[PDB]
Amino acid sequence: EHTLKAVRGSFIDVTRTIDNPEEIASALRFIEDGLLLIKQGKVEWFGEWENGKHQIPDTIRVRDYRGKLIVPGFVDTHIHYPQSEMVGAYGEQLLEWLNKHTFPTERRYEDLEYAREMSAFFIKQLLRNGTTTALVFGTVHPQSVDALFEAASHINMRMIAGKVMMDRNAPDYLLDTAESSYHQSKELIERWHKNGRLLYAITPRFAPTSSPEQMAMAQRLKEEYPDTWVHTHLCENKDEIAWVKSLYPDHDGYLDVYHQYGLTGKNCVFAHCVHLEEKEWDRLSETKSSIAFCPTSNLYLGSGLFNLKKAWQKKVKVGMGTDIGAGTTFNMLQTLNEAYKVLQLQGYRLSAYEAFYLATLGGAKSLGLDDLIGNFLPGKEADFVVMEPTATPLQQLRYDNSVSLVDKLFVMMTLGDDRSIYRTYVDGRLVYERN
Amino acid sequence: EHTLKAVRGSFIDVTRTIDNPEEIASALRFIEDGLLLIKQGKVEWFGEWENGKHQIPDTIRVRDYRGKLIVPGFVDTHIHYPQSEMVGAYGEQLLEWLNKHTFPTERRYEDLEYAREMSAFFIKQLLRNGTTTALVFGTVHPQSVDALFEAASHINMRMIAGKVMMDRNAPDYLLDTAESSYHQSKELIERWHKNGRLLYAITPRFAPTSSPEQMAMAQRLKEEYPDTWVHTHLCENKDEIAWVKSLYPDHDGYLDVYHQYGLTGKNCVFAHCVHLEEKEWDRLSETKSSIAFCPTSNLYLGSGLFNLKKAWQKKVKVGMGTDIGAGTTFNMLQTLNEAYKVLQLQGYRLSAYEAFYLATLGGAKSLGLDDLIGNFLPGKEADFVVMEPTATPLQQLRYDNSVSLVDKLFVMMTLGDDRSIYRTYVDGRLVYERN
Ligand SMILES: [Zn+2]
Ligand SMILES: [Zn+2]
């Protein structure tokens, strides 16, 4: 409420949002001997230790993380809460993956005791990997979303989540109705939206599993609550696209289904977007919609390769998602490593600065939270990660041989996993410690 | 005379080599309550605990690894010893990667104290990841191959290694001559080939960096020592293939340069093989040559996707390699994870049985050592790894949630790292235990 916290160490952040990756080098900030002052869970002062140490009264001990690297909390823009335990070994693609693996897994989260246990486990996985803000697919059952929101509220986490809307083309145990989906999402909105740092997303799974009536209910919810988020899947798989064209033949493609139902615009986030024509690229760019780039699940399911270069050209906001469930890791560093491989296959060179930006401030911007999180600017919420770049013998050996900042970022990205995460602070408090 | 060791736990191995990945299930033996008796570094007896417990003498206590999974030691068919510390810039490709990072890194190994230190480090990395047999690229300098062989012989490891032969198209500090290369490789063969379990490989880096004179010297070495190995790189990158076509215009492509110099045949291993014509597939298959599949470096360098399906159709032996240096991990589980993604991109489903097979007995077969290692058949050399498939909370959850054995192998493949390696035995001796 009024007590100060002081953290010294080496910091990396990006001081402003940009519009081309070539700009990132001029917005990146690295302070080897830096100092972060925290009050009321927000950044109070940040800069060089020699310019700010006078502000620390003799009554306070500084959290001394010298030798570590302190970065803003990672931002995961697409992840499924009720899918941590999922294993899909039989090399299925998207639709068979949904019927064989996704739905039976999410069925176990109808139990509220199981949902309660797994919500704590899910949040701990996030913190364990340095993710402090995520845009989260929930369940179809509203009480499991209640459990997830309660677990996140325990630590005053900034999280966007919502109930999945799906009333057709899925097993009976995982279906709602248009009317029930409207009313349950409305109850969750009134209970959790802008409850502390929590935020609600109107979350239809995708167009195949929602009737026109349910799509209208999602449109109605967005009109009644214009400051909520929208979150859905878009053009992940070609068979999915053909299925959509078969189910909505009178619309001008896949994205046009969401557009006609008023589900495009700012803070509307579309996961995957692997197979877009120009109609849809330009629509996303004019409506200022966001994309959740999920390279790992794209690879595992053989969906394809996301065109990050065309996203930069079209001025579309892109953030990174793990798509846990189909993806296998909660870790943002490994996600960026897989993105690097995906882009190398397209001849696109992903710089370390660009990867770091997409992991932090770029993801926050894609979620419309860049005024709240993403760097160490005074006034930002104090979500950050203390990383140990020497946490593994090979990682330490390659870090001991890196002198430049790009070398350090590249080593962190290519060799990093959960062991690289030494401590995680959320709302200015230590909420995870690797020990 | 000699004494026994008893190892109890859960075991899995493949009991014979196959030629179609569909037969692997028929040859996969899983013993849930099993006993492995070791004498003189070899499998004395293997089978069900109740069928063999009577053979355990009163003088020895059994090593009880119940709750773990015991597998044959992993076989790494292409790895570069003097490259563990290499940190590369982002986005650069094979030939520029070679000239900017690979050669200056390998230059530091002229110092023999540094070579000794890194030889110990390299062996430690192999052991802690469960690799008990590797086909290893050495240096151009004979002293570093001496250091590597000394480290491997200290623990009586079975390792194939050799001095790099390269006399052109590289900085002067990393070049030999045809005559010096022949004589240095002959001295290393005379000192180390069949010294204990050690084996020598005639190792020209690739055709671009070897003159016709040096290629003739390598041919001569292979003719004088027909039981040595041959190990080189082949059709990794399209620019590399075009370079080879310039430097040997009178040969019918890349593989034919090696073939005309009599360097194809049994125990000849060609790394990468990403861009093969159908001529070259048939030539590899008729000469019974082997391929080292390295998915991680293929993806980092934008090389392409190895066609494992055509390798099975053409009946060419394939093993897995890390290309440590360009690759970022010593770990075979992660290597198979990357292979799974590469094959998903090609529409090929890599089975858990197939991945496990290529990691153990299939790899030994590609190296021509399947009569000595690769499973728990009586008489085989006792190189094995005790694995902890539940080594992290997420691994434990996904392993519990798996019902079939292929699901458990898949969990290990997608989530496993060095933390999965609990114990490593080489030559019937415990040589690594996780701290
Ligand atoms: Zn998803
Ligand atoms: Zn190599």
From Swiss-Prot, chains A, B:
Cited Gene3D superfamilies: Metal-dependent hydrolases (3.20.20.140), Urease, subunit C, domain 1 (2.30.40.10)
Q: Which UniProt keywords apply?
A: Hydrolase, Metal-binding, Zinc
Cofactor(s) of this protein: Zn(2+)
Task: Give the catalysed reaction(s), semicolon-separated.
Answer: guanine + H2O + H(+) = xanthine + NH4(+)
InterPro entries in the cross-refs: Amidohydro-rel, Guanine_deaminase, Metal-dep_hydrolase_composite, Metal_Hydrolase, Metallo-dep_hydrolases
Residues given in the record as substrate binding sites: H80, Y81, P82, Q83, R205, F206, H233, L234, C235, E236, D323
Enzyme class of the recorded protein, top EC level: hydrolase
Q: What Enzyme Commission number(s) appear in the record?
A: 3.5.4.3
- Pfam families with a match to the protein in the record: Amidohydro_1
For this chain's record, the cofactor binding note is: Binds 1 zinc ion per subunit.
Specify the domain of life of the species encoding this protein. Answer: Bacteria
Q: Which GO terms describe its molecular function?
A: ammeline aminohydrolase activity; guanine deaminase activity; zinc ion binding
What is the role of this chain?
A: Catalyzes the hydrolytic deamination of guanine, producing xanthine and ammonia.
Family as reported in the entry's similarity comment: Belongs to the metallo-dependent hydrolases superfamily. ATZ/TRZ family.
Q: Could you identify this protein by its name?
A: Guanine deaminase
Origin organism is Escherichia coli (strain K12)
